[PDB]
From a paper:
Cas9 is a CRISPR-associated endonuclease capable of RNA-guided, site-specific DNA cleavage. Cas9 enzymes rely on a dual guide RNA structure consisting of a CRISPR RNA (crRNA) guide and a trans-activating CRISPR RNA (tracrRNA) coactivator to cleave complementary DNA targets. Formation of a complete R-loop leads to the activation of the Cas9 HNH and RuvC nuclease domains to catalyse cleavage of the TS and non-target DNA strand (NTS), respectively. Here we report a series of cryo-electron microscopy structures of Streptococcus pyogenes Cas9 capturing the directional process of target DNA hybridization.
We additionally determined cryo-EM reconstructions of wild-type SpCas9 bound to 18-nt complementary DNA targets in the presence of 1 mM and 10 mM Mg2+, representing the checkpoint and catalytically active states, respectively. The cryo-EM reconstruction obtained from a sample reconstituted in the presence of 10 mM Mg2+ reveals a catalytically active conformation in which both the TS and the NTS are cleaved at the expected positions. In contrast to previously reported structures of catalytically active Cas9 enzymes, the PAM-proximal part of the cleaved NTS remains bound in the RuvC active site. In this state, the REC2 domain is shifted away from the TS cleavage site, enabling the HNH domain to undergo a rotation of about 140° to engage the TS scissile phosphate with its active site and catalyse its hydrolysis via a one-metal-ion mechanism, in agreement with previous structural data. This rearrangement is facilitated by pronounced bending of the PAM-distal region of the guide RNA–TS DNA heteroduplex and a concomitant reorientation of the REC3 domain that preserves interactions with the heteroduplex. HNH domain rotation is brought about by restructuring of the L1 and L2 linkers, which results in the widening of the NTS binding cleft and exposure of the RuvC active site. The L1 linker, which is structurally disordered in the 18-nt match checkpoint complex, forms an α-helix and interacts with the minor groove of the guide RNA–TS DNA heteroduplex via multiple hydrogen-bonding interactions. The L2 linker helix becomes extended, allowing Phe916 to intercalate between NTS nucleobases by π–π stacking, thereby stabilizing the NTS in the RuvC active site. The NTS scissile phosphate is coordinated by two Mg2+ ions, its position consistent with a His983-dependent catalytic mechanism proposed by molecular dynamics simulations. Completion of the guide–target heteroduplex triggers conformational activation of the HNH nuclease domain, enabled by distortion of the guide–target heteroduplex, and complementary REC2 and REC3 domain rearrangements.
Author numbering: 2 to 1013, 1029 to 1051, 1057 to 1366
Write the structure that this text describes.
RNA sequence: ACGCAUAAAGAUGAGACGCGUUUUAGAGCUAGAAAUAGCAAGUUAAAAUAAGGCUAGUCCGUUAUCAACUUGAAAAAGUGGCACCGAGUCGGUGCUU
DNA sequence: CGTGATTCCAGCG
DNA sequence: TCTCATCTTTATGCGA
DNA sequence: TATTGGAATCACG
């Protein structure tokens, strides 16, 4: 019958809980201990923390699942090709495909000859000599005309199909449009054919070198214009050249068409704009544009390949052959030079695989970059290596055909090569002639992103709808899959429902109705004051309509200046007026109205409200679909209203994004006694002038009743089901469920009585208006100021709008002044999606995708950077540019440090020593959901008028309040001492929340969940000053010792005892720390495929691949260990010996074991096991052995420390002060006093060490490490107090709970002492802990046997 | 608690690239009895890329769930007095059952 | 000849 | 690494 | 608001 409160400190990887009473005292209770041990009752305090492994996001699972799908579909492509070829291959060589399938097997396991292709040694050797690589074969098949062996044709086609390339570029890059000079000559001839007055003569100009140079587009244009005698860059030929290279030219000046008619070949609107231009003049110039298109295709081909393609139809194969030949020549030259000049290193370079030489480059794991790093000093220290050095600096020395940078090759190249092979060989083999389209489709077919997995209802990820029930081959995908329905479901399965009407779907963000709702909602709360008016008055419905018609429907954005002058000064004839409710510009805007008015050029069509449904359907279609086919098909129904050009313009426009409200809410429902929708009320509410929130929360209005009727959907769900149904990442579910479970356990412990208050520490914050606005400035402002300070002209070259900067690649392009950050080059603005957003710190090392860890760079450069920080060479080359950007504030100091990390060593392990920025977001949303769940679950009873009775007030305390409470009353928190700080944080949150809701009841609306100089500054100052009643001496002001309730008589705070009570609570030794036992799930083992070795720790990669001959995985992950007491066979006679041991069922064996434990154990060797004496021990199972020493089971063969060091609060405060945590943030008097306190308490350090020492003599039992730490401490006694305190904070890692870790005390480094022996725990006391740790069951394992 | 505008950090799903690794194939030669030594060669390909499963799909297989005990196919339900004095991981005293 | 100390490693753009 | 899409939390600013 | 287990190798009483 004693009232109590529960304080919670939630985190991503920890949940601290505390129970307090009226006097802020944590109760102590006797809990019964179940089990067979003699211990039966234990006294425990109602405070503690729950520790669990962080909930992982589904990112890795999704990536692996997508990889699995891609592998399955690649094998299916190869299977389709084999099915096509099988009929003729059986005539040629029946077992060829069988040999290809079984090539992996060892000689004896093979059912055929070991040679896969030809089946005999001589032919295989001859083939390998004639075609050293596959690319030689591809080049030969493309170029040769004689009949080729069908096996070679299949090999080439299978190589092309298996590795087809990227699909980033749309359309078809005709390989025959390869020559640049010939197409340029054709363009010149076509230009001169109709323009004989001033013919263009470009003879003797090396067009290929000039246009296909590595310089920038503008530089190449200028070079070509200069080489053109008497031609103009802005001329018609100049504009055609600019279009061909990539620049978007203005054709208005060339023909004086009075319209710009800008033509960018990259844009898909190029064709329609060209049709417009033809309508301006005629089709006589069309051949010129066709020649320009061909020249552009040739230029792009040369850029992506950079090879002489004038003699072959397979430019990629020719490039690879040239690369192979140059590799061979350079290798021979390097061998000769090493033999002549540095013979003793020859064996190191060409034989030692362990090194990074050529032997390590080919046979070893050394990459191209590492090989260049190793070989450059040797190359420079020699003679006759000029060409080798030039190649090395160009990254074209001893290259491989299959490298990292092949990812920039479009699939059109392989498509053209495959088409050439088929055309060459179709006459000899008729089945190639009649199956050309089949194989080309196999190469080019790719499931649309909106269709997803092609399941038959057995997949939780599939959404496609099948028109006909049939197997989906790539050749009938168009006839079996309902693409329109699939795309509609793809969009709709992700978009959320309206909160007020959960059955309805939200409107598109750019929908006309949504924009009208936003504009009217913002406008209806505007007050105007003119001379002669006593008070501000709301805008009337007539005035609001006039404003909308005059200002919003004409100007894209309406500023207060226009409203004050265009309307009030002119229409209303008001000389002066003051406007309140809008700061500078109306946030809402009729953007869609202006876009559609420009598209259709019909004011009356949009103004009329009869066709409002038509516009809503138009915007819905433009939002749902992106493919022009589906959009055109949907808009066909409305084609009669508009015209053909208007229809094409509508097709071009594509909105994206969805709003937060439905159409049934904005304009669907109506008031019973008014017959006006919410939008109708917003347009003209009369003198009341209510807005949306007042409308749906008005009792006189009937909208609230309808919302209540529609919101009865959610009832009768279990807690697990409720958590699972929550939208968001599955990472936060673990934390939310654990918090709710510990709250329920605490309620159960206190005799089923609900807590009076539940105070939760929440990551909210309050900032001053200046700081808040300066961190919320639009990125356009940042890039504008950076460009202005940098002195660049990129903004004038390519003007941008703040909306367009939402695209990450464009934003990074502008942030980097348009130039690459890893090489001294210039990025192409139009041709994005060829560069990569590289994480400066590799994504495999640390999870950080902030703007301070992203750089837009060349794809090949990024991929060569690989799993590393940018190399020292890149840092040296680009440090000046990085500093220039840093001075212009285009990049932050953190980004500069990330870029120049290579100078300060490499990726040290300590770099992974800070909190991830993802953890803060996870904590925020975990706390939000926890508050919602607790408020909904605790308060269930409703009043007579259906009003919830707040029996359990949920308070959301901001972390700053508790942090200041700690920093003001010497309750300092040191995170490294132990895990008690979570429980202490929870207790302090409870205390502060209870005190604040006691002394200041009027603050309940601001702290209790439910009801609720700029405003931010006012709230910041208010929150800072609220906690002043805790202070004894303000600033000097001495408030009374015992704080009164205020307007009532209560003891809200008593500084004489309450501080003492809190100090006593924070120094309690017994705090219930629980490590949640988790069954390990995830990958079966390490993904690395180890080579063949005679070891039984290897796991076979297939059931028929014995690891003694094929290698395989190792290091399996143990799902949970199993305590088994049984009999094993010992000796040759195999006598039965009784043994008790842990087995460690791995993840891969978990299903087999759980299906039949006895048979599995007997297979493992143990005999006469007991199905009842088998004990399932998950990871982190707790065993108490002796002297209170606790070990947590980490696996079948390793233990973790399971004890917490209860350091007294005085030592913790001394460590916090001496270490200068957060430097010194006190007044000079207080800083001097604290420094004197530290100096007078030097001896504490010794005592602190003693503590740790004695702890390590009782629990840790690490003799060598403890002796090393003592020796280091004795060595560093003469150091200053600050360094010693910091290094002792480091030293506390020895006695922390969890897996042992290695630490550093000054210079000395102490490695981790691992307890790789689980023999002891077999004769210890296993402890099953409830989620709060209060309820325990102790099992004496020594009694088992 | 919510709607807009701006921003920062994140999340979820789909379609695709490029590598990497494993085993085999690409007859290594000579001197050697061998141990080995000298020389030549090196760039490519096939297959696998969680074992695997039944629902046989161009599907699914690494997120989420999980203290012990009792009842249960599961879902889920149930199981553990209090007060006070103290405190090195909780101990003691009284009451009560 | 088991056992404690030590070293090395971990699929990725 | 690329392409496409949809969500969340938090901060500031207007309005209840 | 955080954070290592598997495996091999070697000294050595
Ligand atoms: Mg916290
Ligand atoms: Mg498979
Ligand atoms: Mg990268
Ligand atoms: Mg905490």
């Amino acid at each position: 019958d004693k009232k109590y409160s529960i304080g919670l400190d939630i985190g991503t990887n920890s949940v601290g809980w505390a129970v307090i009473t009226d006097e802020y005292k944590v109760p102590s209770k006797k809990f019964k201990v179940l089990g067979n041990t003699d211990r039966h009752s234990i006294k425990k305090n109602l405070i503690g923390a729950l520790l669990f492994d962080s909930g992982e996001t589904a990112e890795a699972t999704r990536l692996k699942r997508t990889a699995r799908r891609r592998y399955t579909r690649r094998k299916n492509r190869i299977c389709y090709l084999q099915e096509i070829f099988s009929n003729e291959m059986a005539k040629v060589d029946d077992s060829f495909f069988h040999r290809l399938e079984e090539s992996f097997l060892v000689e004896e396991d093979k059912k055929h000859e070991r040679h896969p292709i030809f089946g005999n040694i001589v032919d295989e050797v001859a083939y390998h000599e004639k075609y050293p690589t596959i690319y030689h074969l591809r080049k030969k098949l493309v170029d040769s005309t004689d009949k080729a062996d069908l096996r070679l044709i299949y090999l080439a086609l299978a190589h092309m199909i298996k590795f087809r390339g990227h699909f980033l570029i749309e359309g078809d890059l005709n390989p025959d449009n390869s020559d640049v000079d010939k197409l340029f000559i054709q363009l010149v001839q076509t230009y001169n054919q109709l323009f004989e007055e001033n013919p263009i003569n470009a003879s003797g100009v090396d067009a290929k070198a000039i246009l296909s140079a590595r310089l920038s587009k503008s530089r190449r244009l200028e070079n070509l214009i200069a080489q053109l005698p008497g031609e103009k860059k802005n001329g018609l030929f100049g504009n055609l050249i600019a279009l061909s290279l990539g620049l978007t030219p203005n054709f208005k000046s060339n023909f004086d068409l009075a319209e710009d008619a800008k033509l960018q070949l990259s844009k898909d609107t190029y064709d329609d704009d060209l049709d417009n231009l033809l309508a301006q003049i005629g089709d006589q110039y069309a051949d010129l544009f066709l020649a320009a298109k061909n020249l552009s295709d040739a230029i792009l081909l040369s850029d992506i390949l950079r090879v002489n393609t004038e003699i072959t139809k397979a430019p990629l194969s020719a490039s690879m052959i040239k690369r192979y030949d140059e590799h061979h020549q350079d290798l021979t030259l390097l061998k000769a030079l090493v033999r002549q000049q540095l013979p003793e290193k020859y064996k190191e370079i060409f034989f030692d695989q362990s090194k990074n030489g050529y032997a390590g480059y080919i046979d070893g794991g050394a990459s191209q970059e590492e090989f260049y790093k190793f070989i450059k000093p040797i190359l420079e220290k020699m003679d006759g290596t000029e060409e080798l050095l030039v190649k090395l600096n160009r990254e074209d020395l001893l290259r491989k055909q299959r490298t990292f940078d092949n990812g920039s090759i479009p699939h059109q190249i392989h498509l053209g090569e495959l088409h050439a092979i088929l055309r060459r060989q179709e006459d000899f083999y008729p089945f190639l002639k009649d199956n050309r389209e089949k194989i080309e489709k196999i190469l080019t077919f790719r499931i649309p992103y909106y269709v997803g997995p092609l399941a038959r209802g057995n997949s939780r990820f599939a959404w496609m709808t099948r028109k006909s029930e049939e197997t989906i081959t790539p050749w009938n995908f168009e006839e079996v899959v309902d693409k329109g329905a699939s795309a509609q479901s793809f969009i709709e399965r992700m978009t959320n429902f309206d909160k007020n009407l959960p059955n309805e779907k939200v409107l598109p963000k750019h929908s006309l109705l949504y924009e009208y709702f936003t504009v009217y909602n913002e406008l209806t709360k505007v007050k105007y004051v003119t001379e002669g008016m006593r008070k501000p008055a709301f805008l009337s419905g007539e005035q609001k309509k006039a404003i909308v018609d005059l200002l919003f429907k004409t100007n894209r954005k309406v500023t207060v200046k226009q409203l004050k002058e265009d309307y009030f000064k002119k229409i209303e004839c008001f000389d002066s007026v003051e406007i309140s409710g809008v700061e500078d510009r109306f946030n809402a805007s009729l953007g869609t109205y202006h876009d559609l008015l420009k598209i259709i050029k019909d004011k009356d069509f949009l103004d009329n409200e009869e066709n409002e449904d038509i516009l809503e359907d138009i915007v819905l279609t433009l939002t749902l679909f992106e493919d022009r086919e589906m959009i055109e098909e949907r808009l066909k129904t409305y084609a009669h209203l508009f015209d053909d050009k208007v229809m094409k313009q509508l097709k071009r426009r594509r909105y994206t994004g969805w709003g937060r409200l439905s159409r049934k809410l904005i304009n669907g429902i109506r008031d019973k006694q008014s017959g006006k929708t919410i939008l109708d009320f917003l347009k003209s509410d009369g003198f009341a002038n209510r807005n949306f929130m007042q409308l749906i929360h008005d009792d006189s209005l009937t909208f609230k009743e309808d919302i209540q009727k529609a919101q009865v959907s959610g009832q009768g769900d279990s807690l697990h089901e409720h958590i699972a149904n929550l939208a968001g990442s599955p990472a936060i579910k673990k934390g939310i469920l654990q918090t709710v479970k510990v709250v329920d356990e605490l309620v159960k412990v206190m005799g089923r009585h609900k807590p009076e208050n539940i105070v939760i520490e929440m990551a909210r914050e309050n900032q001053t208006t200046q700081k808040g606005q300066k961190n919320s400035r639009e990125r356009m402002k940042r890039i504008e100021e950076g460009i202005k300070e940098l002195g660049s002209q990129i903004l004038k070259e390519h003007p941008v709008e703040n909306t367009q900067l939402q695209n990450e690649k464009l934003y990074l392009y502008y942030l980097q002044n348009g130039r690459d950050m890893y090489v001294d080059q210039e990025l192409d603005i139009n041709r994005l999606s060829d560069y990569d957003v590289d994480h400066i710190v590799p994504q495999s090392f640390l999870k950080d995708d902030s703007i301070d860890n992203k750089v837009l760079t060349r794809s090949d450069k990024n991929r060569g950077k690989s799993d590393n920080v940018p190399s020292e060479e890149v840092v040296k080359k680009m440090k000046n540019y990085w500093r220039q950007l840093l001075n212009a504030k285009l990049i932050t100091q953190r980004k500069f440090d990330n870029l120049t990390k290579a100078e300060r060593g490499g990726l040290s392990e300590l770099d992974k020593a800070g909190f991830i920025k993802r953890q803060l977001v996870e904590t925020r949303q975990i706390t939000k959901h926890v508050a919602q769940i607790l408020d909904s679950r605790m308060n269930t009873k409703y009043d007579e008028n259906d009003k919830l009775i707040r029996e359990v007030k949920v308070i959301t305390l901001k972390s700053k309040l508790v942090s200041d409470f700690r920093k003001d009353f010497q309750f300092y928190k040191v995170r490294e001492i132990n895990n008690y700080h979570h429980a202490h944080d929870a207790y302090l949150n409870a205390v502060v929340g209870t005190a604040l809701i006691k002394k200041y009841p009027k603050l309940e609306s601001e702290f209790v969940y439910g009801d609720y100089i700029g405003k931010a500054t006012a709230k910041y100052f208010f929150y800072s000053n609220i906690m002043n009643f805790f202070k004894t001496e303000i600033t000097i002001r001495k408030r009374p010792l015992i704080e009164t309730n205020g307007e009532t008589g209560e003891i809200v705070w008593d500084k004489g005892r309450d501080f003492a009570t809190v100090r006593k609570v924070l120094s309690m030794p017994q705090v219930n720390i629980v490590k949640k036992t988790e069954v390990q799930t995830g990958g079966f083992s390490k993904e690395s495929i180890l080579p063949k070795r005679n070891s039984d720790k290897l796991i076979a990669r297939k059931k028929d691949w014995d690891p003694k001959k094929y290698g395989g995985f190792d290091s399996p992950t143990v799902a949970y260990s199993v305590l088994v007491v049984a009999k094993v066979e010992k000796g040759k006679s195999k006598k039965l010996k009784s043994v008790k041991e842990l087995l460690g069922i791995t993840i891969m064996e978990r299903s087999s074991f759980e299906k039949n434990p006895i048979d599995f154990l007997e297979a493992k060797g143990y005999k006469e096991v007991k199905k009842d004496l088998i004990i399932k021990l998950p990871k982190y199972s707790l065993f108490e052995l002796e002297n209170g020493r606790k070990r947590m089971l980490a696996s079948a063969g390793e233990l973790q420390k399971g004890n917490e060091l209860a350091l007294p609060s005085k030592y913790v405060n001394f460590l916090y002060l001496a270490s200068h945590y957060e430097k010194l943030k006190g007044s000079p008097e207080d800083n001097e006093q604290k420094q004197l306190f530290v100096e007078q308490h030097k001896h504490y350090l010794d005592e602190i060490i003693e503590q740790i020492s004695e702890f390590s003599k009782r629990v840790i039992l690490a003799d060598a490490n403890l002796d090393k730490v003592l020796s280091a401490y004795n060595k560093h006694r003469d150091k200053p107090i600050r360094e010693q305190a910091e290094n002792i904070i480091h030293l506390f890692t020895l006695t922390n709970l969890g897996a042992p870790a290695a630490f550093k005390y000054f210079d000395t480094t102490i490695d981790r002492k691992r307890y790789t022996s689980t023999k002891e725990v077999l004769d210890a006391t296993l402890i099953h802990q409830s989620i709060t740790g209060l309820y325990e069951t102790r099992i004496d394992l020594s009694q088992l046997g």
